[PDB]
Design a protein around this ligand. Structure first.
Ligand SMILES: CC(C)c1cccc2c(-c3ccc(CNC(=N)N)c(F)c3)c(C(=O)O)[nH]c12
Ligand SMILES: [Zn+2]
Ligand SMILES: [Zn+2]
Length: 232
């Protein structure tokens, strides 16, 4: 009924949308992994009379539910999707998207890592993102590679029309105590990568983490803090 939806409010298999700004939504779903339930976010950006999707809803059935929820609440076709790193909360559901006619994209690094992990593999490679600080335009967003953080391949997404920064899993929510799932992370480089994001997007008004509640620019410094406390 208005506030941002939390993990215990979304049964596994249902998807919520949340209006972030004009023409910008987040999508929220929940999934089981190793016997615990987690929420996760993605993004939807209006692209004329089409939509750009950022990240799957963490699984095939969740992603089918996402497409149905978009049709119900927005009613414009999803034509392209970008996955922001190789984990299943970002690519699980790419096969559903591809069979629904959505063109799926990721960096070559993400595609290689997804293939090696046994995860679903986006079809198209996004060049121009291999060096930290690189940025490319993709429809109504800018894609930015900040350097290694949560994963070596993680991308962030900026919506310039709305000053919305989608940090993905390189950014944690303010209530977070922990650095999340760090299995593939670079804890030493992560603060430097966050500093790059801070320098590149100083006018961000909304910052969306990969998991949990959006906030403002403070999510960036908070993330650096939680990662440094973890590494130590
Ligand atoms: C590898 C991938 C598919 C995956 C599986 C299971 C958990 C995670 C997490 C995670 C783990 C705990 C928290 C703490 N917050 C809570 N609500 N439990 C959090 F935010 C994310 C991340 C992440 O870190 O990207 N990724 C995950
Ligand atoms: Zn991840
Ligand atoms: Zn994640």
């Amino acid at each position: 009924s208005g506030e941002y939806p939390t993990v215990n409010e979304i049964p596994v298999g249902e998807v919520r949308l949340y209006q972030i700004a004009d023409g910008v939504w987040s999508h929220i779903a929940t999934q089981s992994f190793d016997g615990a339930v987690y929420p996760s976010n993605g993004l939807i950006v209006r692209d004329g009379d089409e939509l750009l999707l950022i990240d799957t809803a963490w699984g095939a059935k969740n992603t089918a539910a996402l497409l149905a929820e978009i049709e119900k609440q927005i009613g414009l076709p999803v034509t392209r999707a970008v996955s922001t790193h190789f984990h299943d909360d970002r690519v699980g559901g790419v096969d559903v998207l591809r069979a629904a006619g959505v063109a799926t994209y990721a960096s070559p690094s993400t595609r290689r890592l997804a293939e090696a992990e046994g995860n679903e593999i986006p079809t198209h490679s996004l060049e121009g993102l291999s060096s930290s600080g690189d940025a490319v335009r993709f429809g109504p967003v800018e894609l930015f590679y900040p350097g290694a953080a949560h994963s070596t391949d993680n991308l962030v997404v900026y919506v310039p029309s709305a000053n919305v920064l989608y940090g993905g899993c390189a950014v944690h929510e303010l209530s977070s105590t922990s650095a999340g799932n760090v299995a593939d992370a670079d804890l030493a480089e992560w603060p430097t990568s966050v500093e790059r994001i801070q320098k590149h997007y100083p006018e961000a008004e909304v910052v969306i983490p990969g998991h949990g509640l959006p906030g403002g620019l403070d999510l960036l410094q908070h993330t650096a803090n939680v990662v440094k406390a973890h590494k130590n």
